[PDB]
Each structure stands twice: as C-alpha cells, then as structure tokens.
Amino acid sequence: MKIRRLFKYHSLKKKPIRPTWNKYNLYNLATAGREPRISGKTFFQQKWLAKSLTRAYHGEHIKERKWARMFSRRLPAVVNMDPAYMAKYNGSEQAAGRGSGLSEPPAYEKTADEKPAKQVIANPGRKVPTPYEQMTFAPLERRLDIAIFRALFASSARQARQMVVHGAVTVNGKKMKHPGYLLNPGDLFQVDVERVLYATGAPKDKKLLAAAMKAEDNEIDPSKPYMTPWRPRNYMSAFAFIPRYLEVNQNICAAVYLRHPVARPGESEVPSPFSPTINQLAFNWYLRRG
Amino acid sequence: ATLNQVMRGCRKPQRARHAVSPALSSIKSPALKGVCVKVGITRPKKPNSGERKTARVRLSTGKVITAYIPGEGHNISQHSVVLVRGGRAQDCPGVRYHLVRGALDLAGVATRMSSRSKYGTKKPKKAS
Amino acid sequence: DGLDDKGQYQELKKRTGMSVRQILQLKTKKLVHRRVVNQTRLGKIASDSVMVIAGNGDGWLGLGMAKSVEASIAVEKATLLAIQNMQPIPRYENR
Amino acid sequence: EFNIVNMRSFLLNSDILTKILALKLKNRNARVIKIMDVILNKANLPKINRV
Amino acid sequence: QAAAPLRRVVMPRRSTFWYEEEKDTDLITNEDGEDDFHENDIMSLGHGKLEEHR
RNA sequence: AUAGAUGAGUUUGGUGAUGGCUCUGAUUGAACACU
Ligand SMILES: [Mg+2]
Ligand SMILES: [Mg+2]
Ligand SMILES: [Mg+2]
Secondary structure, eight states, rough: OGGGGGGTTTTTTTOOOOOOOOOOHHHHHHHOOSSSSSSSSSSHHHHHHHHHHHHHTTTTOOOOHHHHOOSOOOBBBBBOOOOOOOOOOOOOOGGGGGTTTTOOOOHHTTTTTSOOOOOOOOTTTTOOOOOGGTTTOOOOGHHHHHHHTTTSSSSSHHHHHHHHHHOOETTEEEEOOOOBBOTTTTTTTEHHHHHHHHHHHOOOHHHHHTSSSSSOOOOOTTSSSSOSSBBBOOTTTGGGGTTTEEEEEEEEEEEEEEOOOOEEEEOOOOOSSSSHHHHHHHHHHHHOOO | OHHHHTTHHHHHOOOOOOOOOOHHHHOOSSEEEEEEEEEEEEEOOOOOOEEEEEEEEEEETTTTTEOOSSSSSOHHHHHHOOEEOOOOTTTTTEEEEEOOTSSSSSOOOOTSSSSSSGGTTTOOTTTT | OOOSSTTTTHHHHHHHHOOHHHHSSSSSEEEEEEEEEEEHHHHHHHEEEEEEEEEEEESEEEEEEEEEHHHHHHHHHHHHHHSSSOEEEOOOOTT | OOOOOOSSGGGGGGEEEEEEEEHHHHHTTHHHHHHHHHHHOOOOOOOOOOO | OHHHHHHHOOOOTTTTTTSSSSOTTTTTOOOOOTTTTOOOOOHHHHOOOOOOOO
C-alpha cells in the first residue's frame, strides 16, 4: 500500500534529497540550492523548512513519532591527544598569565616585526571548531538497515530494510530479521552475497543480452538476477563512501560496527548533505517539536 | 509572607476557573445524551449578526443546557434524542455546548464534502 | 560591481570601510517590528519602528533601530545603523 | 520642418521622464517606491555652496 | 567565430532597470554606464535659448 | 544521571508595565465522528 507521502519521492519540482542512488536523486543532489532562503522567514518557518529538508533524507522510512523519541540531545565527540605533547608538558603552561596563558601581540603587530614570535606551546590541532550541529541524526546511523546502506551493500535505505525483513542479514553469525536492531560496538553484520550483487549490480537487460548470446575475468550467465558479467550500477561512484565507524570487507560482504559516530574537531562522521545552518535548525526543532 | 505565616497555612489553592462546558467537566464525561426540550434560534452579541441554530437539551444527568447545532440544516426537533459534547458558541451567551452530527437522531450534513468527520457524513461512494 | 543600485551603502562604505560586496556577506535579520502611532493636529501618524541586527558569525554583533512612515525605509535605516554599530563580543572558545 | 533634439539623459526633459516612470509602473508586480528611488539615484546634481 | 559574440544572448543584470521586462534578447546589453552624465548636454529649457542663437 | 531550565496570540490613539485567558509539549483503563 503506497501512502500519500511517497508519491513524488524523487520530484524534480520539489527536489528532495533521498537516501538512494537513483539517477533522479543524483540530479536533485547536484543541483541543490547553495543555501535555502531563510532571510525573512520566522523562527518556526525556519525550523519547519529545515525539518522537512533533513527528514527527507535522514530516517525517511521511519515514522515521525518514532524518530521524535529516537532523537537524542547527546552529541558525542572526541579530542586528539598527541603523546609527544603529554610527555614533555604537564599542562601548567596552559595556565600561565592570569589563568588562560600568556598573551600574544595583536595580529597588526606580528607581521610588522620581521621576526616571528616562537611557536606557542599547545597540543597540535587546537583552536579548530567541532561540528556538533552536524550530528543531529547520528542515532539513525546505529540501525541495522541504515548500516547496511552505509556499507555500500544496498542501493537505498529501503532496499537494505528489505534485506533484513527477508532474513538475508546475519549479525554476529546469528540471523537477524529486525531492521530496527541497534548495532552495538563490535557487532559484525553480514549480508548474502547474492543480494548485494543484485542490489549494487546493473539491471538485467534482455535487449543487450540478446545480442550477447554467443558473440580475473568473468563470463555470461543469464541464470542470475543481475546482468553478467557483473558490473557496478550506473552513477554508483557519486555515492561511494564508507564512514569511519565501519570496517567493511567486500570479499565476503561483511562489516563490523567499530563504534558510534562521533564528532571530531573539524570533521563529522554522520553522512548528511545539508549545511550546519540547516542541521542547527533541525536540531532546534526536535528539542520541543515546535 | 514569612516562614511562620506559611507554616500556619497562608498558601491556599487559587480560586477555580469555570469550565467551558460545566455539565461535562463536572463528571469527567466527554459527551452526554439528552432529549431536545426546544429547538429554536439564538442571536449573537454586538459584533456579529445572524441566526444561530440552538437546542435546549435535557441531559441524562438532569441539567438543562443550550447546545449549538453545527452545519447547514438539521433534522432534530422537539422530543429528539441527541448527543452533546463540549465547546461553546463564542458569540452566543449561554450556548456552552455542541451537538454531535452523527448522533442518535441528529443526522450528518448530506451535501458535505470537506471535513466530513466533523459533520458525521459518510463518504459519497460515487467512485464505487 | 553595480551591486548598490540606490546608493544606500555609500555612506556606510565610508564609516565602516568595507566594500559593498563585503557588506552583503553580513548576517542581517529584522527582529522587532512595531506599528507605533502619534496623535497630531492633522490626525494619527502611524510609523513602522523596526530593530535589526548585523553580525559576522565570528564575534561581531550590532543593533540598529529606526522608524519611518514606510516599512521598507525603516528596515534600511535600522540595517545601516546595525552594520555601523557592530562591536566585538567576547566568546569562550568561540562558542 | 522638423528640429529633433537628441537628449543625452532622460532626466533633462520632464515629458520623457514621466513617460518612462509610467511605463515602469504599468506592470502589476512593479514596486512603486523602489522605482522612484532608482530614478532619483540616476539624477546627478552639481556641487554647490549653500551659503 | 567572428559572428559568435554577436548572437550570444546576454543575461540582464540582477538589479536591472531597462531590461526588467524586455523580451527582445537582441537589445539586452550589460547596462553599465548607460545612464552616466558626461556633462555634454543641457536641459530642454536651455536648448530653447541655444536654438534662439542659431 | 553533568545537560536540564526557552516561548507564542490577545487590553492601548500609541508606549512601557500589571494581570488573566488561549495556543505550543507529553499523556489516558477514555468516548464520539469519518475510516
Ligand atoms: Mg469573544
Ligand atoms: Mg480539498
Ligand atoms: Mg488613553
């Protein structure tokens, strides 16, 4: 039963960015506006616009009520500590001066002096912001059906959900048929090779195959759902990327959920096609759903 | 107030606010059945103008209230069993209730297309 | 580059000292909008008092306020005042 | 006999000015106040000593 | 190749005054400096006195 | 349990206050209408 919300799934007029590799979706992603118009809109009109844009991609197949409580105000992050710094300094120099360290001359004086002041001691890679706003939809990255789509085992989040519901996935060597299963750090999910080749392979064309009847490497086998010899789907390279909280092994179509997505200074691990301005309004919406 | 004045019980519950539909709020009921004692017309107050179709209903609890009849045209009259819900007619004084259109004797608006669930109108089924 | 088609940013270009292209990169927003009225010998005179903010998003914010009989003119007055009244705001870790 | 005078700027003649401003305003989506400001901005007045 | 720049359709300026509704793409130009006053003309009232001298 | 604290409409010729009302959030051993 097709609901009213899925009619214009890849509308070229509305241009919604969906979690799939469809060619109509590639055009909507490439030609997306550099910045949505939020000049004269009110605070509600901005949060609703950001909520509609983001929810068109993140957890598209999950009800609004289920995600409303799946949303978490806890945005995890990490910091990089260089052993070379911690071995030479105990952090006292960071509390010099009046508690915040010594003062450096303003920028309009440094370059004036031909001699640059000695490098200030500090852990390398500091004074760079962390994109917390970009982690609004991190909880969705823990579902089994989503992790399968992020491992490049399926062409869409809905096709990966069918692999689970149809007993084609195996977590920790045990059959798992719940797409809402929340992976734990260390879980190893494995999909059937036959479903991955069809999901990511090219469509089976009879007209072109009809000409190839008789006229390492592989051969032809018309007794398989995908076109032989197996070749990658068209436009699959535009969506080819594996996040760092997964360790995929394509030889067996298996991956390990190493950890949860975290935000690092200057980087986020949640695949989202939206800017911090939109992810900041979506986060503000789900604080009180208004 | 001082700690002594509070210890003696200066803090008391604020005076109650009257409900929109006291006949229903008093007993926690969402709706009540009643018989129409009179079906007539009420006149709005200063700003608005027109004739509001109202009904004097005798609730099953014994109270006699005045309910507003939503929609265009009705079927009830004297000695008619109808279901009453909360909500008031803002411009009508004393009309603090509404009648349900898909009620026992009150029928839904026949030539209704939009918001049929508000007026107890079955779907035309013209397609089937 | 023909960006200023009404010469409204000409005086602001002297006070602040940044090109019109850099002025258009600021984050402006009309926050408050009141419809005030003054009783005069000639009847009521309703004005549009507005408040506008301007900032870089990196530690600068300015508040402007102006009124006028036209709602459009008041928004431009407040915008020019907001861009010239910008001040550095101290931030802890820029957050 | 015709004596046609070519004007370098449309602001040097009132007839040509009200004609242009009228054609601009004839459109439904024309911003009245904005169009008047663009015309006045095109008008250059010479420097003067008020005293 | 020499006639290419002649048939190239020019996009009107974002904030344009003359080509805001012009649908004849042949007349659309850059519009830069087309309204600058080069101090080479007087008012219509002056031409009446100049023609009187002629 | 260290993230958890938020507003909006509405009195006046207008402005700032005072002070209610309503909406925004969550829910029910619910009922009714359309399904
Ligand atoms: Mg009232
Ligand atoms: Mg309709
Ligand atoms: Mg008074």
